[PDB]
Copies of this chain bind each other. A is one copy, B any other.
Amino acid sequence: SLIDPRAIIDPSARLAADVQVGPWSIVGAEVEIGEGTVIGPHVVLKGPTKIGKHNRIYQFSSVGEDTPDLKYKGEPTRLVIGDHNVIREGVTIHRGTVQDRAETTIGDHNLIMAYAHIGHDSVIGNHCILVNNTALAGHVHVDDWAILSGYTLVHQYCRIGAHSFSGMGSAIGKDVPAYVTVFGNPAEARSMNFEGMRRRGFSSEAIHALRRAYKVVYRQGHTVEEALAELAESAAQFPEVAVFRDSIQSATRGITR
């Protein structure tokens, strides 16, 4: 059928009628798979885990394993994956811990390339790209349209802002505000992702307002609280600047400079 007979499907697994599963893949207990999803060959799915519609998961991926994190001690934690995601070769995704929200969450239209790691309790939004070997250490929040280039390392609890960009081999120990571009080990704030803003149809007015907001946070010698007070006027006028100001206000590990 669409389920390869060489696949192991746990009787407790729930598959929508058109789900494809390849040879030598394991669909574990308490795994749910939504309509149109294709599971390649040599995939291990472990639950409790929910996968949505029209997803593609590639060979040698381990989706829904326990974190090796020594704070995890066997409790019933979840992984939720949305719709229209692509999960490439050798990707590892772990379920959450009771210490946080007992859930790891991915939304829709994400591209997660080969040997990427999505650590316990991470939250990925929609339309994100994680290039080869991007490692999210745990409790990492990645907001919509962020792009992490190959071998980007993200420390535990870091927030990656909407429409942000990391250069290849970036080592992120602090939060990346929305729209900010970071490079290097350790990661350094260069500019804003003006290329991504134009690709996603931002107004000229919003881009100019974001250009000015960067300057207020990074280039006028303000403390963060001083910069947040200076951003208030622009943030009230433009939602993009409010997105920026909020990423800064909610950046619990401080911002990448």
Contact = CB atoms under 8 A, between A and B. Distances in A.
Interface of A: 8, 23-24, 26, 41-42, 44, 58-60, 62, 65, 68-70, 86, 88-90, 92, 111, 113-115, 117, 129, 131-133, 135, 137, 150-151, 153, 155, 168-169, 171, 173, 184-186
A66 to B, nearest CB: 10
Contact of A111 (B23, B26, B68, B92): B68
Contact of A42 (B24, B68, B88, B137): B24
A86 B65 CA distance: 14
A168 B153 contact: yes
The secondary structure that dominates the A interface is loop
Given A68-B88, A133-B135, A135-B132, A150 B153 contact: yes
Nearest to A23: B8
A186 B186 contact: no
Contact of A89 (B41, B92, B169): B92
Nearest to A129: B69
A57 to B, nearest CB: 13
A167 to B, nearest CB: 8
A137 B173 CA distance: 24
Contacts of A23: 8, 24, 26
B70 A111 contact: yes
B58 A60 contact: no
A252 to B, nearest CB: 18
A62 B89 contact: yes
B62 A59 contact: yes
Nearest to A111: B68
A117 B90 CA distance: 12
